[PDB]
Write an enzyme that holds these catalytic residues in place. Structure first.
Site, short mmCIF file in Angstrom:
data_model
loop_
_atom_site.label_atom_id
_atom_site.label_comp_id
_atom_site.label_asym_id
_atom_site.label_seq_id
_atom_site.Cartn_x
_atom_site.Cartn_y
_atom_site.Cartn_z
CB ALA E 159 -0.52 -0.22 1.24
CB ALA E 161 -1.97 5.23 -0.80
N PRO E 162 0.87 7.31 -0.85
CG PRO E 162 1.17 7.95 2.22
CD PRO E 162 1.01 6.82 0.38
N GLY E 163 3.73 8.15 -1.41
CA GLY E 163 4.31 7.54 -1.77
C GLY E 163 6.16 7.85 -1.47
N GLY E 164 5.78 8.93 -0.61
CA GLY E 164 7.45 9.05 0.82
C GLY E 164 7.75 6.82 0.55
CG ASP E 210 -8.18 -6.78 -2.80
OD1 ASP E 210 -7.92 -6.23 -2.20
OD2 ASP E 210 -8.18 -8.10 -3.01
CG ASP E 227 1.73 2.62 6.34
OD1 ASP E 227 1.36 3.41 5.81
OD2 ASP E 227 1.01 1.90 7.01
CB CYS E 284 -1.06 4.79 11.00
SG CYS E 284 -0.81 6.90 11.38
#
Lengths: 177, 147, 96, 55, 356
Positions: E159, E161-164, E210, E227, E284
RNA sequence: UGAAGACAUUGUCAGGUGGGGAGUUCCUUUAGUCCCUCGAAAUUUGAGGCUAGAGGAGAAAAGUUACCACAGGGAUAACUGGCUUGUGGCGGCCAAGCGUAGCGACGUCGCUUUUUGGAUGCGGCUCUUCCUAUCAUACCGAAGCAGAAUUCGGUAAGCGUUGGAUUGUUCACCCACUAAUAGGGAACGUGAGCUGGACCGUCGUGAGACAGGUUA
RNA sequence: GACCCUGUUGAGCUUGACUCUAGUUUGACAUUGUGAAAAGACAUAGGAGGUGUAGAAUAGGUGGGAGCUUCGGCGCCAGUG
């Protein structure tokens, strides 16, 4: 994905040779018996390693959204437009280079044309409509484009004068966010 | 609501400057190239890059609105709430894309301070509200919550 | 790229010629300097790839993704001339 | 004044003027009571005697 | 009501709970005192009874009060440098010359740089637009230094999503290897791709699958990072809705998906890897149902996975036991990160080796 | 006959992909039985499954947009003229009435909005006449208006109505004389006087350039 | 100034059938031996074990239990869970 056709690769290499000096360096085989290839996914072309492409085939077409470095897109009229995503390759093997001070480097990122009041260094003997990558004073690749005049005309030019036509800049990363 | 806000407190360049920069970069100005929209708008993020499709529409600082007066009917009350997004302007797709606020305009408003209990036991954090005034004549935005 | 290759050569080449190579590289560092300081300051080593020694082209061999570690033998070469030449190299690198 | 700068018609200018001058009036109508209190204290101070602290 | 009066009353209740034996009432008990404190903190801090009670069971009074003050207070600015383009010293020098206040985030990361105040927009700086640094969080730094990826490997960011995290993986693998970056939402994958192309990464494959069809699609990755989507009780500062929008139903659906994801990651790694057979699970949230119960489930339903030392500088060990349920003893190797002790977003990490 | 070597290479089943070759014309949402399986937490859920509505000639290309650049076509071609001025908008309550649900003024309540005291991006000067929406002067009404100095309002245009600092200019604020140092019109040309480009052509176009031509 | 339409272009969105299949790719198995040295999991037989919060206290866990007894210290009982 799908590999490029002969005419499509001809067009892509025409644009790439317009902007760069050596291209057999790009398509040269590497140490581990691997080479870089070109692939098209949803009218975008991607510069990527053959190993990465062959390991990326397991992904269904609707689900592959990126692969390697996106060079640009083929438009509906059949012409190739290059991208700020393809800037790094241009910096690596650029033909003509133009260095801009801070006073024009910030405007260039905002999306403005380069001016003689901005230019800080030239490449000697640059023809009229040639391929110049725009850097700053710190040798940081800032964008790319086509210059307006030759070196002599730019020298003789009014300092409040256009010397380069903007085509792509790093600010589009602040767009696609 | 106001005491809750007070106790919580107890705990880039504008598009005009960007356009002037582009003009300094470009000698020849096409006649009427600067197309400023003279209607109040909502933007959101302070600094952003627009698509080349809409890079010609200038939205002025004096016309930007970030906050609105929303009325809840069932619990009769008017509260000042922040605007999240312009959702639909039934006058122009271009207007709703640029975020133009006109009469009867559907927008998304934060109702976090209002504290609406929903069916699932949730807490409401965004709801539709219809702008029911003329912000172009009145220096304010008045909306009624669709609840 | 040429600095790295010439350091390897001077490591593997006889005494008087190696002295000449060290002198040439000292002159190169004097003239350019800031351009090649990263080849000896390891904190500025680029991490955008790996050094390819047996390359085919100068640009192909990533020169800034490596460090000149040869000194650790050319300071114990048998010739005082090459030893003092390397000392002068480090001296001017330091006085950059 | 900024909205008037970016106005585009006489009707818009009139509505913007009317809005501005009426918003200022609503503010005063809110400041009804402090004005009365200040008037009363003004009168009382104006009638207070002069007492010199150090004499 | 008077929430300052309630702050005072919370302080009184905390001291009463601290020194009940000496300082007490005629007949009022711990139960009444803690119930009053629960209501107090629910009222002032805008937390629903369920989540507020859960965090109260999570921490001793003093620590709970510190935790909620921290959750009310935002985090400082922190940025990650691209080792693919520059290094921390030169980047900090250039930014200071541009006029922003920075200093190294600590001695635990050599790539991180904390920012306090700025005169130029941090996301508009020429180096940022050239891809020299990324606005990430130290909590997001942690999972990759847990899973340090070696050069010429296959990694799966299940996962991304942000990319960092994907970009930091690329930095540590030196633009070598293959990174399958999956994100199940096209809109956020757009920003993922944008960040990848800005930071100059050439070994990424972005998929919109998915995350649970991975052993079917590819399988056999050398290393995987997971994550897990969670309740968000660690970024309550950034997302204030979590304070009162997390109920029992939520804390039953979320962990089931996380458990399925962890099983998928275990099945996706390979046991016979020449350099690394590592799964790294990060979360998180700070809730035990969200945190380390999925680890117990993994070690209970796949015997061929072994929990291994996390190799992270700081943190607190995982909980071997809780209100009734006893976990595997080895779970102490995991680490927990909270805002009040360390000024970082609250995370949980877990490192696994595959053997079979 | 020599070298290499338990790794390769190779084979088989299960899948992922397939814009390339040959042949032919699956998931997601809705409702229901609490009907079955599968996961998960133990005193309950999530995903499949059943019933029938809704979504997804064919690698050549196609459809679409109140968007963009260029080229062209059409309509409009000035404009306000018993206009303008002092009192904001939105929603609720009340509301004579009209009506027999709908419109509904004045007020009130909520937002703007509160428990401790620079903006602006054509200007400026002289004289005639007029207006009053009066700065001073004359006369009045009211005010804890003791006196003094005043404030608000009324009739009044008879009589007069500066100089600075600052700024590209102006206003705001501030500073000096003065009784005061008001605001306007001379009617789309702000009474009289003075002062401080668009068409073509070449080459382009991700972009403009021409000591190329013509012209009001 | 502005507004509507057309042509080319850019920017974006949607569509571009189904079944096998080359290519590509993931997992498992097999040839296939002789040994040696290490690691893991299975076989017993032992030995040793548990510090989230509070609770005096390092509470594997469950089962019964009001009395236990090297006969004086404990249970229960009150907590706190």
């Amino acid at each position: 994905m799908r590999p490029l056709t002969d005419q499509e690769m001809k067009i892509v290499l025409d644009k790439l040779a317009n902007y760069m000096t050596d291209l057999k360096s790009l398509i040269a085989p590497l140490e581990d018996g691997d080479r870089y290839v070109f692939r098209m996914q949803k009218d975008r072309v991607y510069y990527v390693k053959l190993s990465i492409a062959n390991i990326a085939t397991c992904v269904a077409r609707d689900k592959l959204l990126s692969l390697g470095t996106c060079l640009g897109k083929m438009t509906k009229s059949g012409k190739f437009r290059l991208h700020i995503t393809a800037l790094p390759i241009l910096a690596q093997n650029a033909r003509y280079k133009i260095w801009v001070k801070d006073n024009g480097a910030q405007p260039f990122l905002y999306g403005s044309n380069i001016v003689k009041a901005h230019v800080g260094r030239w490449t000697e003997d640059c023809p009229e409509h040639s391929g110049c990558v725009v850097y700053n004073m710190a040798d940081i690749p800032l964008g790319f484009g086509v210059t307006a005049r030759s070196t002599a005309e730019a020298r003789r030019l009014d300092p409040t004068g256009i010397v380069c036509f903007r085509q792509a800049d790093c600010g589009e990363y602040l767009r696609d966010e | 609501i106001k005491n809750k806000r007070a106790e919580k407190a107890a705990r880039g360049i504008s598009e005009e400057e960007m356009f002037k920069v582009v003009k300094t970069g470009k000698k020849t100005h096409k006649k009427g190239w600067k197309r400023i929209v003279t209607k109040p708008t909502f933007v959101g993020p302070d600094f952003t890059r627009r698509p080349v499709k809409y890079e010609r529409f200038i939205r002025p600082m004096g016309l930007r609105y970030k906050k609105a007066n929303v009325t809840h009917p069932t619990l009769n009350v008017t509260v000042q709430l922040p605007i999240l997004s312009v959702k639909k302007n039934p006058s122009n797709p271009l207007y709703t894309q640029l975020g133009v606020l006109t009469k009867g305009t559907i927008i998304e408003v934060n109702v976090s301070d209002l504290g609406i209990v929903t069916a699932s036991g949730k807490i409401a954090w965004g709801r539709y509200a219809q702008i029911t005034n003329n912000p172009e004549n009145d220096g304010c935005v008045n909306a009624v919550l669709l609840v | 790229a040429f600095c790295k290759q010439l350091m390897t050569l001077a490591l593997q080449v006889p005494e008087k010629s190696s002295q000449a190579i060290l002198g040439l590289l000292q002159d190169v560092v004097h003239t350019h300097g800031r351009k090649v300081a990263a080849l000896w300051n390891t904190e500025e080593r680029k991490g955008d790839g790996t050094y390819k020694p047996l390359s085919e082209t100068v640009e192909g061999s990533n020169p800034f993704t490596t460090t000149i570690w040869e000194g650790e033998l050319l300071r114990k070469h048998y010739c005082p001339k090459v030893r003092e030449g390397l000392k002068a190299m480090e001296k001017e690198l330091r006085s950059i | 004044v900024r909205l008037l700068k970016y106005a585009q018609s006489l009707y818009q200018c009139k509505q913007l003027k009317r809005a501005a001058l009426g918003r200022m009036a609503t503010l005063i109508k809110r400041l009804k009571d402090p004005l009365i209190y200040l008037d009363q204290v003004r009168q009382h101070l104006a009638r207070l005697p002069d007492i010199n602290p150090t004499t | 009501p008077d929430l300052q009066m309630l702050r005072t009353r919370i302080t009184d209740t905390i001291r009463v709970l601290e020194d009940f034996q000496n300082l007490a009432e005629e007949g009022r008990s711990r139960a009444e005192y803690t119930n009053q404190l629960l209501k107090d903190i629910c009222a002032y801090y805008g937390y629903n009874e369920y989540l507020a009670e859960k965090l109260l069971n999570l921490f001793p009074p003093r620590e709970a009060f510190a935790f909620f003050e921290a959750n009310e207070t935002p985090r400082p600015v922190v940025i990650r440098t691209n080792t693919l383009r520059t290094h921390r010293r030169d980047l900090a020098q250039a930014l200071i010359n541009r006029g922003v206040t920075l200093e190294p985030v600590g001695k635990w990361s050599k790539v991180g740089l904390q920012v306090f105040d700025s005169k130029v927009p941090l996301g508009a700086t020429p180096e940022y637009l050239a891809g020299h640094y990324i606005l990430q969080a130290a909590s997001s730094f942690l999972p990759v230094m847990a899973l340090c990826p070696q050069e010429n490997e296959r990694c799966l960011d299940m996962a991304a999503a942000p990319g960092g995290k994907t970009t930091h993986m690329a930095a540590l693998m030196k633009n070598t290897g293959v990174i399958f970056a999956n994100d199940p939402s096209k809109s956020r994958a757009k920003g993922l791709i944008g960040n990848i192309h800005r930071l100059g990464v050439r070994n990424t494959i972005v998929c919109n699958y998915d995350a649970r069809e991975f052993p079917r699609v590819i399988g056999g990755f050398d290393r995987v990072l997971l994550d897990a989507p969670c309740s968000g009780t660690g970024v309550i500062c950034k997302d204030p809705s979590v304070k009162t929008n997390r109920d029992a139903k939520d804390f039953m659906q979320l962990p089931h998906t996380q458990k399925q994801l962890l099983l998928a990651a275990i099945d996706s790694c390979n046991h016979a890897s020449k350099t690394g057979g590592y799964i790294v699970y990060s979360t998180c949230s700070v809730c035990v149902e969200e945190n380390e119960e999925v680890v117990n489930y993994a070690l209970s339903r796949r015997p061929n996975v072994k929990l291994v030392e996390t190799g992270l500088p700081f943190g607190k060990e995982g909980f071997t036991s809780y209100m009734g349920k006893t976990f595997h003893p080895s779970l102490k190797l995991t680490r927990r990160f909270y805002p009040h002790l360390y000024n970082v977003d609250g995370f949980f990490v877990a490192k696994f080796k595959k053997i079979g």
